[PDB]
């Protein structure tokens, strides 16, 4: 449970921690040892000074070198240990994420995970770093001061000590509370990150439907809750230190009241009391030094909760286990028997009510039925993605649950219904099928899958960089690449899930011939809705209610006049000083004013304790009337109490006004940044440097890095600067000629700080540039887990992540040495200065240039700034990283796009009739400028007409759809809506009228009702309209049959539904707007013949009154089109009515002559 974050420590890390703790103890035992000679001189003061102060200077000079070594040994080893354990924890967390099963991904939300690697890990990196060394040093100083107090005093030290246990108990309680608070804060941040990645992954649909504001508010709610938690966290963290300081000062007042009895009892001398006080009081500031370390440790302990909860889990179907069975001569034989299955998300519904199947080697089985019977369900069940509730699945007699999972999945080549590619080159995507593949095999596969032509046509032939999820390829090229990826594997069992949809007739024929050439040695399962591809199948079977009903050859099933017969008959780099972020925080200026004033008050009091001590020294060395000693000293007994009451008031506010002011700004720093990328042009998201992982990592990383240096950590920096200023002013006022000696070392410390800052600033930029690359791989593997599991590429992704985590590891190791050396230098130069100042004070009192009663005061005041100097020097890395973080935040905020979604300038005509005119339009994509996709096309559409765009795959038919929505602007030519340029028209007004259906629809993680209602924004869509649209899309019956009718959540990108169901939902979403212009892009690609007829009749009924542009391959849909436009290398070569182009025996005639039985 506790100390669970150190469970990846070797012998070396334990050695590092042990030696670092010892060095911290030695280094912290330095300051209390300097008070012995202080008290001895004070007692003697109540031929010898030049004999004593010189040996005191000798001792100080020796302690200086001791500290010089000990501080480095303390800092560097702890930093190295923290870096190594952080690297191991990251690596093992990713490994444990890879080990989970598909059902776990379905039940849980993976959106949190991507933001748990970046932020949640980093917080741990602060709790187990050098902060533990600082806490150990503070504890050592506390105990050494109390030990020397015991040696020089018996009862006063015990009286002071009598109040330590309550302080420890209070610290423990507050740490426990805020550790619990940190968990909820991090959970809220995780929810915000999940929303951010969900919005960023489907940016094209969000831009198309103009739903930026709704997603912005949905993201802002979680930030508001995070701020609400952070305020309470700051409040309790501040009370933790305020109560401690108040108790310390009350204890000091009681101790002084007791010690004033020296005059009456006579047991002790004034020198002993002065020694005891001056030695004990160092612990009073050691507690304040220690508290932030406890805060950071509690934060890290609260952060490790979910990380180790995830790692501690154990899957049921583990792909990494090698304890399975495996055969050698595997023959192709598939056997389903009494398979009952239900998905984990919806356990109540039954999908397979018991089916049986037998497939022999060299056999092609086709499964035919309506949408929702469970064809893809049994395809997934074959790969052992899920385990059936009842019955068993076997290959060659042996049960699936017995043989090895990795071996079983390595002999199955699967093409899923919707291919998913990765953000790499084409060659790497092909090579992902099998690791050890030569170029010859890849060439053979891409020739067999009919993908050789367009690959050679592109520049960077086999190194062309595809986008995320293969978004930079076409709709058919993606499917061909997936087919080639499956064919590289050379599998015993091949499973195709409608791999013949996007391909046209020629490519389909080529692929079918190539596949049938080597059909004898394979076992094959094919899922298809077209029936021409099923004609040449070895055996055809029919689904109904999840159970198989029909079997046999084509002729036998036709004679059986069953489902198959019915279907056949129906078919007939600017650096910024971060002071700009300070200026951005201007609105909360009173908080800063109160914080600075309070910090000045409570920081400049510790040196003033030297003046107080000198005054109570003088009150003892009076001449007469001891009664005033009972009286005057009594006055001081009040003062120590009074300060405490102020201290509680001050040490609270100093942290609060600052701590709150950070929480206000951090939210404002995210809310704006997300408001900026949500505005950027689509071409900005095509930049390889910008990917969902990079953006989602940046969102958390920039704000966290700024908050690290901008938060309550600045309060202690201000306090310590005030302490140094008060000390130097006190030394300048009472003493003199010694402030110059103390300032003689400022240039050296300044040079050390400058060089440290320069080196850390050089390091941080290179670390930041690679952290995004580290996060991209994590998000790319997380979002496409089904494809990765099916390809068994879990080891390669883990290796790539480990390779990406390399440079930050080296930078973290080097930072340890750099920081340790600088810390030791600045910590030792000041002890050397103390020795020099003591010697010079001895000389000055020898020459009668200045008394010793006041150089005593000067030394006492100056020595109190050692811990302050240490704290100030411990602020380098935070500012070093926050500088570039603020620079990048300002850069992203100040950027403006070219096509502004938020702008209001433009023309918004009252009425439009709906003419579309493309005139001599040429266009080139930004990522591949050299490739011409459109070469001067012209398109004319009037109101109440339907245009069908046809052509070979990759001819630019969806490019016009992208252009009409103003995703990109053409290089030349003209685009006119109602005789007016779209450039002059308003962008949001243009996008609010026309609705589109993408080539591959993407939904969101919410209910079906909200998914349908998302079509029309800036309006509350009534439930009646939603139901009417669902009925018009022929999905109302299925939705109503579903338990939790309209409240069932659709999974990430719409995976809890079949392809046809979510395509119908997308059509319904597009039809809610009742758009004046409709853009259909393969809307009927995956639809049953009944849903197709219903949707077609619905669109035909309301054809008059609106404009529609359809892109399709099925010629039956194109039959009803008013006019048809044929593409040819970008140009439009044929245009006219159906009959006119029927007479002109061109490409359309070629496509219609091939669909004849
Ligand atoms: N991951 C999932 N979790 C829960 N239910 C699911 C999931 N995937 C699919 N379903 C349900 O399974 C049923 C149909 O799923 P599928 O087996 O994919 O249908 P299908 O045969 O693939 O349809 P076609 O022929 O591909 S258009 C529907 O009721 C879906 O809601
Ligand atoms: N983001 C992109 N950057 C550069 N080129 C792209 C991008 N997306 C697509 N292309 C190319 O532009 C052409 C247009 O094809 P796509 O619109 O992607 O799909 P498609 O198969 O052509 O569908 P249509 O309707 O026929 S255009 C193809 O040559 C694609 O390879
Ligand atoms: Mg399917
Ligand atoms: Mg296409």
Curated annotation (Swiss-Prot):
User: Main EC class of this protein?
Assistant: translocase
Q: Which keywords does this chain's UniProt record carry?
A: ATP-binding, Cell membrane, Cytoplasm, Disease variant, Glycoprotein, Lipid transport, Membrane, Nucleotide-binding, Phosphoprotein, Repeat, Translocase, Transmembrane, Transmembrane helix, Transport
**What ranges does the Extracellular topological domain annotation cover?**
151-157, 259-272, 614-637, 735, 839-854
User: Where does the record place the ABC transporter domain?
Assistant: 334-570, 916-1154
| One GO CC term on file | cell surface
Which residues are on the Cytoplasmic side of the membrane?
80-128, 179-234, 295-592, 659-713, 756-815, 877-1157
Q: What is the effect of changing residue 127 to V?
A: In a colchicine-selected multidrug-resistant cell line; confers increased resistance to colchicine
Q: What is its main location?
A: membrane
Query: How is the activity of this chain controlled?
Result: Translocase activity is inhibited by verapamil and is sensitive to energy depletion. Inhibited by nicardipine. Inhibited by PSC833. Inhibited by vanadate. C1orf115 regulates drug efflux through modulation of ABCB1 localization and activity. Not inhibited by amantadine.
Topological type in the membrane: Multi-pass membrane protein
**Database matches in InterPro entries:** AAA+_ATPase (IPR003593), ABC1_TM_dom (IPR011527), ABC1_TM_sf (IPR036640), ABC_transporter-like_ATP-bd (IPR003439), ABC_transporter-like_CS (IPR017871), P-loop_NTPase (IPR027417), Type_1_exporter (IPR039421)
The record places domain ABC transmembrane type-1 at 17-299, 592-881
Q: Which GO terms describe its molecular function?
A: ABC-type xenobiotic transporter activity; ATP binding; ATP hydrolysis activity; ATPase-coupled transmembrane transporter activity; carboxylic acid transmembrane transporter activity; ceramide floppase activity; efflux transmembrane transporter activity; floppase activity
Which residues are ATP 1-binding?
369-376
Recorded consequence of changing residue 774 to A: Risk factor for IBD13; has decreased enzyme activity
GO BP term, example: ceramide translocation
- Which cellular compartments is it found in? Cell membrane; Apical cell membrane; Cytoplasm
Q: Which domain of life is it from?
A: Eukaryota
Give the reaction(s) catalysed: ATP + H2O + xenobioticSide 1 = ADP + phosphate + xenobioticSide 2; ATP + H2O + phospholipidSide 1 = ADP + phosphate + phospholipidSide 2; a 1,2-diacyl-sn-glycero-3-phosphoethanolamine(in) + ATP + H2O = a 1,2-diacyl-sn-glycero-3-phosphoethanolamine(out) + ADP + phosphate + H(+); a 1,2-diacyl-sn-glycero-3-phosphocholine(out) + ATP + H2O = a 1,2-diacyl-sn-glycero-3-phosphocholine(in) + ADP + phosphate + H(+)
Concerning SMART domains, the annotation shows: AAA
What family is this protein classified in?
A: Belongs to the ABC transporter superfamily. ABCB family. Multidrug resistance exporter (TC 3.A.1.201) subfamily.
Q: What does this protein do?
A: Translocates drugs and phospholipids across the membrane. Catalyzes the flop of phospholipids from the cytoplasmic to the exoplasmic leaflet of the apical membrane. Participates mainly to the flop of phosphatidylcholine, phosphatidylethanolamine, beta-D-glucosylceramides and sphingomyelins. Energy-dependent efflux pump responsible for decreased drug accumulation in multidrug-resistant cells.
How does it associate, per the subunit comment?
Interacts with PSMB5. Finds in a complex with ABCB1, TFPI2 and PPP2R3C; leading to the dephosphorylation of ABCB1.
Which clinical disorder is mentioned? Answer: Inflammatory bowel disease 13: A chronic, relapsing inflammation of the gastrointestinal tract with a complex etiology. It is subdivided into Crohn disease and ulcerative colitis phenotypes. Crohn disease may affect any part of the gastrointestinal tract from the mouth to the anus, but most frequently it involves the terminal ileum and colon. Bowel inflammation is transmural and discontinuous; it may contain granulomas or be associated with intestinal or perianal fistulas.
Q: What is the protein's given name? A: ATP-dependent translocase ABCB1
Source species taxonomy? Eukaryota, Metazoa, Chordata, Craniata, Vertebrata
């Amino acid at each position: 449970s506790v100390f669970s974050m150190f469970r990846y420590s070797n012998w070396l890390d334990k050695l590092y921690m042990v030696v670092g703790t010892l060095a911290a103890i030695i280094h912290g035992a330095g300051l209390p040892l300097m008070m012995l000679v202080f008290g001895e001189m004070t007692d003697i003061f109540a031929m010898n000074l030049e004999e004593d102060m010189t040996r005191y200077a000798y001792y100080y000079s020796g302690i200086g070198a001791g500290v010089l070594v000990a501080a480095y040994i303390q800092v560097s080893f702890w930093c190295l240990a923290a870096g190594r354990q952080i690297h191991k924890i990251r690596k093992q967390f990713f490994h444990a994420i890879m080990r989970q099963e598909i059902g776990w991904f379905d039940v849980h939300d993976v959106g949190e995970l991507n933001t748990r690697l970046t932020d949640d890990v980093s917080k741990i990196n602060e709790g187990i770093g050098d902060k533990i060394g600082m806490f150990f040093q503070s504890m050592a100083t506390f105990f050494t001061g109390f030990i020397v107090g015991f040696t020089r005093g018996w009862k006063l030290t015990l009286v002071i000590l009598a109040i330590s246990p309550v302080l420890g108990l209070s610290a423990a309680v507050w740490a426990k509370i805020l550790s619990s608070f940190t968990d909820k804060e991090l959970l809220a941040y995780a929810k915000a990150g999940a929303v951010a990645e969900e919005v960023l992954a489907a940016i094209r649909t969000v831009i198309a439907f103009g739903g930026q504001k709704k997603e912005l508010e949905r993201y802002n709610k979680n930030l508001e809750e995070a701020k609400r938690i952070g305020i309470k966290k700051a409040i309790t963290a501040n009370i933790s230190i305020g109560a401690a300081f108040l108790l310390i000062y009350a204890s000091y007042a009681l101790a002084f009241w007791y010690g004033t009895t020296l005059v009456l009892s006579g047991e002790y001398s004034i020198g002993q009391v002065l020694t005891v006080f001056f030695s004990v009081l160092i612990g009073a500031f050691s507690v304040g030094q220690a508290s932030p370390s406890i805060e950071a440790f509690a934060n890290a302990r609260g952060a490790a909760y979910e990380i180790f909860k995830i790692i501690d889990n154990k899957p049921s179907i583990d792909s990494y286990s090698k304890s399975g069975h495996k055969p050698d001569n595997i023959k192709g034989n598939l056997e389903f028997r009494n398979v009952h299955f239900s998905y984990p998300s919806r356990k109540e519904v039954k999908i397979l009510k018991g089916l049986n199947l037998k497939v022999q080697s060299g056999q092609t089985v086709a499964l035919v039925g309506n949408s929702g019977c469970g064809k893809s369900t049994t395809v997934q069940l074959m790969q052992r993605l899920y385990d059936p509730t009842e019955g068993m699945v076997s290959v060659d007699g042996q049960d699936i649950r017995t043989i090895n999972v990795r071996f079983l999945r390595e002999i199955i080549g699967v093409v899923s219904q919707e291919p998913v590619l990765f953000a790499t080159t084409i060659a790497e995507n092909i090579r992902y099928g099998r690791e050890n593949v030569t170029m010859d095999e890849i060439e053979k596969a891409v020739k067999e899958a009919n993908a050789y032509d367009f690959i050679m046509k592109l520049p960077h032939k086999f190194d062309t960089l595809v986008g995320e999820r293969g978004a930079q390829l076409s709709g058919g090229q993606k499917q061909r690449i997936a087919i080639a990826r499956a064919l590289v594997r050379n599998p015993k069992i091949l499973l195709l899930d409608e791999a013949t949809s996007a391909l046209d007739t020629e490519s389909e024929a080529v692929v079918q011939v190539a596949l049938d050439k080597a059909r004898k040695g394979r076992t094959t399962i094919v899922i298809a809705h077209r029936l021409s591809t099923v004609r040449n199948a070895d055996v055809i079977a029919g689904f109904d209610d999840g159970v198989i009903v029909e079997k046999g050859n084509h002729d036998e099933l036709m004679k059986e006049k069953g489902i198959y017969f019915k279907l056949v008959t129906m078919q007939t780099i600017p650096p910024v000083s971060f002071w700009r972020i300070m200026k951005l925080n201007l609105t909360e200026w009173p908080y800063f004013v109160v914080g600075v004033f309070c910090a000045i008050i409570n920081g400049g009091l510790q040196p003033a304790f030297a003046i107080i001590f000198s005054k109570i020294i003088g009150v003892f060395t009076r001449i007469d009337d001891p009664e005033t000693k009972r009286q005057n000293s009594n006055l001081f007994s009040l003062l120590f109490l009074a300060l405490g009451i102020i201290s509680f008031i001050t040490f609270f506010l100093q942290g609060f006004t600052f701590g709150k002011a950070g929480e206000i700004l951090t939210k404002r720093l995210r809310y704006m940044v997300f408001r900026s990328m949500l505005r950027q042009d689509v071409s900005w998201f095509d930049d390889p440097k910008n990917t969902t992982g990079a953006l989602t990592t940046r969102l958390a990383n920039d704000a966290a890095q700024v908050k690290g240096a901008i938060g309550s950590r600045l309060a202690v920096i201000t306090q310590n600067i005030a302490n140094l200023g008060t000390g130097i002013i006190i030394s300048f006022i009472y003493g003199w000629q010694l402030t110059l000696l103390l300032l003689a070392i400022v240039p050296i410390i300044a040079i050390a700080g400058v060089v440290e800052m320069k080196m850390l600033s050089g390091q941080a930029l290179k670390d930041k540039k690679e952290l995004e690359g580290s996060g991209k791989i994590a998000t790319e593997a997380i979002e496409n887990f089904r494809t990765v599991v099916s390809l068994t590429q879990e080891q390669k992704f883990e290796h790539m992540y480990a390779q990406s985590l390399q440079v930050p590891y080296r930078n973290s190791l080097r930072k340890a040495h750099i920081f340790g050396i600088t810390f030791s230098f600045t910590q030792a130069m000041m002890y050397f200065s103390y020795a020099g100042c003591f010697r010079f004070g001895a000389y000055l009192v020898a020459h009668k240039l200045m008394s010793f009663e006041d150089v005593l005061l000067v030394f006492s005041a100056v020595v109190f700034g050692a811990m302050a100097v240490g704290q100030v020097s411990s602020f380098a890395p935070d500012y070093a990283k926050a500088k570039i973080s603020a620079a990048h935040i300002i850069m992203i905020i100040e950027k403006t796009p070219l096509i502004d979604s938020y702008s209001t300038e433009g023309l918004m005509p009252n009425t439009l009739e709906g003419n579309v005119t493309f005139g001599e339009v040429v266009f080139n994509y930004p990522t591949r400028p050299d490739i011409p996709v459109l070469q001067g096309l012209s398109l004319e559409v009037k109101k109440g007409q339907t245009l069908a765009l046809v052509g070979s795959s990759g001819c630019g038919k969806s490019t016009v759809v992208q252009l009409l929505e103003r995703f990109y602007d053409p290089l030349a030519g003209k685009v006119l809506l109602d005789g007016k340029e779209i450039k002059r028209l308003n962008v949001q007004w243009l996008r609010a009228h026309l609705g589109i259906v993408s080539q591959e629809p993407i939904l969101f993680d919410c209910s079906i009702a909200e998914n349908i209602a998302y079509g029309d924004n800036s309006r509350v869509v009534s439930q009646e309209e939603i139901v009417r649209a669902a009925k018009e899309a022929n999905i109302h019956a299925f939705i109503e049959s579903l338990p939790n009718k309209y409240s069932t959540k659709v999974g990430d990108k719409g995976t809890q539904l079949s392809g046809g169901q979510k395509q119908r939902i997308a059509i319904a979403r597009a039809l809610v707007r009742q758009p004046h212009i409709l853009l259909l892009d393969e809307a009927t690609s995956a639809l049953d013949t009944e849903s197709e007829k219903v949707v077609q009749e619905a669109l035909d009924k309301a054809r008059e009154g609106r404009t529609c542009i359809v892109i399709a391959h099925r010629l039956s849909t194109i039959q009803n089109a008013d006019l048809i436009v044929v593409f040819q290398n970008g140009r439009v070569k044929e245009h006219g009515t159906h009959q006119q182009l029927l007479a002109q025996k061109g490409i359309y005639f070629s496509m219609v002559s091939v669909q004849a039985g």
